């Protein structure tokens, strides 16, 4: 990045929703245009109904963009309060961007967390239908292919969050030639509700994701690796419960005792029968015996406890492991009695 | 199908009876009841618990003119309906409806 | 006519914005559509849908698929099921309807 | 409540779909036919290509049918996946029935919800591609106009689910002088598709929602209002 | 029965499958375009790699349109296997027709076939 190589400062501006692949790369001008920060204010004044999509010039040349994210703030909620979401929002998301740096950007956790929360931009959808506003921080740069390996981690805070704003993250906009409604302008020619500015920030140089000017206090990282090398995780999905209270909770359904419980790790519990004898009638079929042992299977976010051979002889049971945050702090305060 | 009366309070229709209560408002009840007589592009705005109060305030903010109530002397009020007394005919949900009676008798009307 | 032939559409009033239910459909799948650009209101049920495969697929779990998946819709939802052999990817319905949280109530109140 | 009322073990039957209505009434051999529980079995052994039509003889002598739903999904499912749908299925759909049987029925919520996940008959179709089968509660007894009256509250409850079973049902079956097809029959000459029992049940008894036997176990309900009142 | 049902010479081609609904109510000409018989050849002359898709105007104005069907086989078949399947198939698809348009349509069935 430095100065040098910095010419990611243009505008590649669309004009129409969905515009045809075979257009772009021909650069037709009644599609796509070439603009500065000065010349793109002019031509928002001059059209008042233009509609125009921020978007990147070639991802193999400059794939330096801003972090930049979106929030749909809808649903039913009474306590719509603004204030106090917004600058707790910034936190969570702040501490989980950092944490991911870390782990696998080798950046420094206190650098990251510094420029980040130092200074940011936002928006505001006049739309009170449903409200959708956009949040880019300035100093924190970095290449769009860490964003979509880091699309998994940002969907699963999403899913055990306390914010409804962070509980409404939209991690779609993290893709291949990614589009950004530039502010102040309409989405369709029929519907009039734009993106209006929020004060301090007036100047359009900083609500764009692709005008990058790295001063001396800004921060960079990236992925080390390639893309194309990623791992999945583990058949856990570290998020919800500590593997032995999981297991524990298994072992109360069944009243019997399992031979077998010492040889289940992290890993092996997906494919181990559970050999059980049945001193007792089974907790399930309320049979006397069975011909196969149980087994235990990870989908969805719950353990499928079922039989093999004729699964239709036994009966299935589902065992939730909540997933919420909160919910797991009240149950270890109820725990300690 | 709401009325205001003399005294401050709101009656509501509803259970074909005008019932009414100072502590529990009956109007989002009212609402979520009638929501099946609309057309199918208004009933997914009357889900949201926000949106039906939004619509209590809004039903709130229009009755201006008091009305009085049991102004007929002649009509016999049940729990489901009005018994009138004039032909011995019984009527029931709209039609007994326009003579805004508050007490009854407090069982069911059974012709049988 | 239509009245005696079918009660039925493509896209009756009460359901939510097509862009809409694309982007409830656009989050099951965790990754990006390639061809998104060739969908709209009138031929989402016959365009097949190539998705690129970073991550595993979060409906079947496996790494890759052989064929693209393909949308469908009855009774006011569009189901997901993947063409070519019909046993590798399951089954994923995206409801259009309403407020879940009044689905909650109304069977938590069935139970009695 | 005299003998005849409790017990049908007569059998009305059609052998053509759109069958006209004036070859019902006059009731020839050559479309409709009665059959009891043996007969019936003789007479799919000696036709193994027959196409029969379950229906009700007369509607305003006798309503008192099973209850029975239908389910179409075209879509394969694996069987672990199909057998958490039907727990679902049927945890829902007890659910549904009884409090409709509470609140305009006039009858006793727990004792539908005893005599419906008890003891219930299903079948499965010999199609591969599509999973599809007809599930009539063994135990549970009421007169057609109760499921026409039904019908609203079925249809709300399959477009208000995540299941893809019980979003399938097939809720324009309801309707006045209803056709169910018999287990063991094809639709049309030209089809191969055929449904075929379940254990344990193995007698054909257990598959028809015409055949009333009100035992020990079964519970009655039904509207007290009619269905000129209910505008 | 007027002049509209008993004529329509205007053709309406889009050019990109999927256009926006947003976009062909307000008939952009970057989307979509609406040609007569001379000049519709002019153009796909004029472009070497257009991409066009015949479509219905106004539905609920001008429903009237011909009789069409879709054949694809992924399998290849000869000439002469070919030309005896054709009829048959034709054969087979005008007693379809013709068959619902008696029962359902009224139609003259031997006038349809
Ligand atoms: N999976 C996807 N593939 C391609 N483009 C997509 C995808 N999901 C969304 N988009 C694009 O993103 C655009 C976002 O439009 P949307 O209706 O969400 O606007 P909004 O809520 O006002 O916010 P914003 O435009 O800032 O996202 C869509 O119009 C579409 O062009």
Same mark, same amino acid.
């Given at each position: 990045?430095? =100065? ?18 075979? &257009? ?5 001008? @009644? ?29 193999? =040349? ?12 809808? =649903? ?30 080798? =950046? ?66 993290? @893709? ?9 302008? @309409? ?94 009638? &089974? ?33 299935? #049971? ?6 919420? #945050? ?5 149950? @270890? ?5 | 199908?709401?009325?205001?009366? /003399? ?6 229709? !509803? ?8 502590? /529990? ?5 009212? !609402?979520?009841? !009638? ?9 997914? /705005? ?12 809004? !039903? ?7 009305? /009085? ?44």
């Amino acid at each position: 990045m430095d =100065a040098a190589i910095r010419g990611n400062d243009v505008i590649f501006v669309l004009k129409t929703i969905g515009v045809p692949s075979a &257009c772009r790369q021909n650069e037709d001008p @009644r599609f796509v245009e070439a603009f500065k920060c000065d010349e793109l204010e002019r031509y928002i004044d001059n059209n008042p109904e233009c509609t125009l999509f921020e978007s990147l010039r070639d991802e193999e =040349a400059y794939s330096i963009v801003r972090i930049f994210m979106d929030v749909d703030l809808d =649903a039913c909620l009474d306590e719509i309060d603004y204030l106090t979401a917004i600058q707790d929002f910034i936190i969570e998301v702040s501490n989980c961007v950092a944490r991911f740096a870390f782990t696998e950007c080798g =950046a420094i956790h206190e650098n990251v967390i510094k420029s980040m929360r130092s200074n940011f931009s936002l928006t505001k959808s006049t739309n009170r239908d449903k409200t959708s506003f956009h949040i880019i921080f300035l100093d924190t740069y970095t290449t769009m292919d860490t964003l979509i390996a880091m699309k998994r981690t940002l969907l699963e805070l999403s899913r055990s969050s306390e914010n409804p704003l962070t509980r409404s993250i939209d991690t779609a906009v993290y @893709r291949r030639k990614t589009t950004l409604r530039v502010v102040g302008t @309409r989405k369709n020619p029929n519907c009039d509700t734009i993106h209006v500015m929020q004060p301090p920030h007036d100047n359009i140089e900083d609500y764009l994701f692709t005008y990058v000017d790295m001063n001396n206090n800004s921060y960079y990282f990236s992925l080390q690796r390639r893309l194309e090398d990623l791992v999945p995780d583990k058949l856990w999905e570290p998020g919800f419960i500590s593997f032995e209270d999981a297991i524990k909770r298994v072992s109360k359904i069944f009243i019997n005792s399992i031979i077998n419980f010492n040889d289940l790790d992290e890993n092996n519990f997906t494919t181990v029968p559970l050999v059980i004898d049945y001193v007792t009638p &089974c907790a399930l079929c309320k049979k006397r015996s069975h011909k196969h042992p149980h087994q235990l299977s990870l989908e969805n976010g719950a353990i499928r406890i079922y039989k093999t051979g004729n699964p239709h002889s036994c009966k299935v #049971k589902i065992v939730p492991l909540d997933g919420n #945050k909160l919910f797991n702090i009240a149950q @270890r305060i109820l725990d300690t009695n | 199908s709401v009325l205001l009366t /003399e005294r401050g309070d709101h009656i509501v229709w !509803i259970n074909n009876s005008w019932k009414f209560n100072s502590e /529990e408002p009956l109007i989002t009840k009212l !609402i979520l009841s !009638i929501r099946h007589q609309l057309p199918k592009e208004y009933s997914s /705005e009357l889900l949201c618990p926000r949106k039906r109060k939004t619509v209590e305030a809004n !039903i709130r903010d229009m009755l201006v003119d008091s009305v /009085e109530t049991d102004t007929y002397p002649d009509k016999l009020p049940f729990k489901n309906g009005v018994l009138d007394l004039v032909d011995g005919m019984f009527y029931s949900g709209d039609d007994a409806k326009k003579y805004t009676c508050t007490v009854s008798t407090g069982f069911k009307f059974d012709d049988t």
